Design a protein around this ligand. Sequence first.
Ligand SMILES: [Zn+2]
Ligand SMILES: [Zn+2]
Lengths: 6, 176
Amino acid sequence: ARTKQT
Amino acid sequence: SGNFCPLCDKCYDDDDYESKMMQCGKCDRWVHSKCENLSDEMYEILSNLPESVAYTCVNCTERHPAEWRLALEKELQISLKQVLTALLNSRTTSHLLRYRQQPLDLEGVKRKMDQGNYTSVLEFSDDIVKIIQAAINSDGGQPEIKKANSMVKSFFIRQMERVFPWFSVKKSRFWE
Ligand SMILES: [Zn+2]
Ligand SMILES: [Zn+2]
C-alpha cells in the first residue's frame, strides 16, 4: 500500500 | 501539480510529502488517512504492508471490505500476538509475569487478546509495561530478582521496537 511515508 | 482528496475534497500538491495520505493504485488519487477513519497507528501499519497489497479508494474498491482493510486488520492482530507469544514462551518472563499470586498478568493479557479486545498498540504495550514495572517496584531489593526484571524489560523493549519501529515503548506512562 502506497502512502506519503512509503 | 495536484488534485483533491476524493472524500473531503481538500486540495494537495503532488510533491508534498508532509501529509498522511494513501494513493489509490487504480485512479492514482491520494486520500487522507482521516478520510478512511484510520488512526495514526493504523496509518503506520498500513505503510508497512507488502507492496502487493494495494490501497484502493472508496470509488475504486469493487469488493467490500477492501483487500487492504482485511490485510491491515490481520496485520495488527498478528503483530500484537507476535509480541505476546514471545513473552508467553519466554521462560524467565513467563515465570515472573504470566501468572500473578485491568490485566494483572500476561495470562490476563492473553484472555484480552483472545477475546479480540486489543486494537491499540499503546494500550497493549501499556498493559505489559504496567505488569513489568509492578514486578520491578516489588523486587524487594532482592538482586537476582532485579537482574531478572531488568532483563525481561530489555527483552520486551526490543520485541516492541522490532515489531513496531514507529512506536515509542520507552515513553510509556507506566515506566517509573
Ligand atoms: Zn480527504
Ligand atoms: Zn481510486
